[PDB]
């Protein structure tokens, strides 16, 4: 209250106010990198250069990537499935291990058809049935 309490004969108050100049936390040595990553295929890449929010990679290159919608619909020679039409690789990059010749066969729908058989066909127990023993 600004009106202020009436002063007694022995007014004790206890000062709790402290002045001083606030501190400043250190600056992380930032490193900017500039290169054609998306080739023109990302949320921040498809936008005009006047407004491209720079990333940070707080987490890692695995998640800062997935943050960008990096997909691609490029054609490729077909050697799987029936009917015409060249194989159309179409899936968005999540991690950096996506270019691994393995995560590809898991992503591309057509190739996965052959990998699906290798789970069932190759798992034929011709060792449990052949091993009859009376």
């Amino acid at each position: 209250a600004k009106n202020k309490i009436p002063n007694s004969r022995l007014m004790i108050n206890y000062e709790t106010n402290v002045d001083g100049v606030l501190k400043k936390k250190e600056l992380p040595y930032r490193v900017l990198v500039v290169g054609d990553l998306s080739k023109g295929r990302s949320v921040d890449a498809k936008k005009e250069f006047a407004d491209r929010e720079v990333r940070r990679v707080n987490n890692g290159v695995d998640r800062v990537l997935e943050e960008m919608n990096i997909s691609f619909d490029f054609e490729a020679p077909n050697f799987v499935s029936k009917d015409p039409s060249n194989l159309k690789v179409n899936y968005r990059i999540e991690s950096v291990k996506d270019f691994r010749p393995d995560a590809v066969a898991k992503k591309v729908p057509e190739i996965r058809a052959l990998l699906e058989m290798k789970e069932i066909l190759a798992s034929f127990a011709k060792d449990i049935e052949n091993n009859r023993n009376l």
């Binding site: 400043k24 490193v31 990059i93």
Partner: protein, 427 residues
């Protein structure tokens, strides 16, 4: 026989262009953000070279209006609460073209002001050769640049902005091609895939510019030390341990393939430093590297007066302009706090000196690291008020960094005059 398909199906798109273009442009991104230090936050900005080519070439004579310049200088470095950048990294390869020369002229125009040494790489098209390995055949690049083909380039080396550009030579192998016995594709828990080959032979299976490891050492030379003395030489900075080599069985017995694009000799390490290039030289077989030279593209000159000659030798040196830059990030950053406080010529010389004082010595500490804490040797700071403007000042510092080793000649000889007691007449 389903393996025969997959070994053809997948191998059709891994070898495909565009697909492996993203690989190159992400593998070398992962390479930078692999270390992860205590206080070194990297950051990305995916932009096509053309989208910047058009930018600087349109605003070369009006850089303050450049869109990029407005996303590094006046955006984070200039503004109050903004966090400034430090040492940009150009993931591109620059030729001797009269277009790509502007690209550097512009980016350097920014770096110069934003105080952020722009590191990049140069294509094999620079030396006018279609295979970078064939640069070893050139005797001395010093005599090369005298050729009138580099006229445009020699003009750029004279610009002030070039003292912030730092171009690297050589490209490290960033991925080992896929063999079953070597670097097997990690298949799934049932889908047999590890039996899977690729298709390469001579020299065409993914590369990445040395500039990465260069910057990825500047980061290292910050978490450990604090300044940028720790990015040169073997014992000191650039060592780059454990690179992705390659091995292959053509007919012999797994003949290893050196991780580096080119096996620079000794006088190559030097004969490049004079051109204003940063060679990424390899130790034969050791599967490692090191940066001996870290020079900017600035001309070294020569001069008659000894002092002047030494000036130009230190200015061309990138590692110092990295450090001197860190003082700018101190002034335009910290003194902003006391912008309204009543201060004097004798007070600003206090605040600015009391800081830098903890980083200047003459005595040498054991080991390189324990001494690289101290970049500078000695500093002067003569600020002084100007007439007219009462609250304004004008500083003028001058720093002499700890001069690095760079080489030496030596003449051995049998004197037989040192100990005359054995060869003298009197006996």
């Amino acid at each position: 026989v389903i393996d025969k398909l997959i070994d053809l199906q997948v191998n059709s798109i891994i070898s495909n262009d565009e697909f492996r273009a993203l690989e190159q442009e992400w593998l070398k991104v992962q390479e930078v953000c692999q270390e992860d230090y205590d206080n070194v936050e990297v950051s990305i900005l995916d932009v096509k070279k053309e989208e910047l080519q058009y930018d600087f070439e349109r605003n070369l004579y009006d850089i303050s209006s450049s869109d990029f310049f407005k996303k590094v200088y006046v955006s984070e470095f200039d503004q109050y609460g903004g966090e400034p950048y430090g040492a940009i990294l150009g993931l591109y390869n620059f030729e001797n073209t009269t277009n790509d020369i502007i690209w550097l002229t512009g980016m350097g125009m920014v770096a110069k002001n934003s105080h952020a040494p722009f590191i990049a790489s140069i294509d094999k098209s620079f030396f006018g050769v279609k295979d970078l390995s064939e640069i070893t055949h050139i005797k001395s690049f010093e005599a090369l640049l005298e050729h009138p083909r580099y006229k445009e380039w020699n003009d750029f080396r004279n610009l002030d902005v070039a003292a912030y550009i730092g171009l690297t030579v050589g490209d490290f192998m960033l991925r080992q091609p896929y063999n079953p016995e070597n670097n097997p594709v990690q298949y799934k828990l049932m889908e047999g895939f590890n039996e899977f080959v690729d298709y390469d032979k001579n020299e065409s299976y993914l590369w990445g510019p040395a500039s990465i490891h260069l910057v990825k050492n500047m980061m290292r030379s910050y978490d450990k030390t604090r300044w940028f003395q720790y990015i040169r030489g073997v014992e000191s900075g650039g060592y780059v341990k454990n690179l992705v080599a390659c091995v292959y069985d053509n007919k012999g017995i797994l003949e290893t393939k050196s991780p580096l694009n080119v096996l620079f000799a000794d006088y190559m390490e030097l004969s490049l430093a004079n051109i204003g290039l940063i060679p990424f030289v390899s130790e034969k077989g050791t599967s490692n590297a090191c940066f001996f030279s870290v020079n900017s593209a600035k001309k070294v000159e020569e001069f008659v007066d000894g002092f002047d000659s030494a000036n130009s030798r230190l200015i061309a040196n990138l590692s110092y302009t990295m450090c001197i830059s860190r003082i700018s990030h101190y002034i335009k950053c910290v003194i902003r706090d006391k912008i309204g406080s009543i201060v004097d010529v004798e007070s600003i010389q206090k605040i600015l000196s009391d800081w830098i004082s903890e980083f200047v010595t003459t005595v040498y500490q054991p080991t390189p690291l324990e001494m690289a804490r101290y970049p500078f040797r000695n500093v002067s700071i003569e600020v002084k008020t100007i007439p007219g403007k009462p609250g304004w000042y004008s500083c003028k510092i001058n720093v002499i960094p700890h001069i690095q080793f760079e080489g030496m000649n030596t003449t051995m000889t049998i004197d037989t005059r040192l100990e005359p007691e054995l060869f003298g007449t009197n006996n």
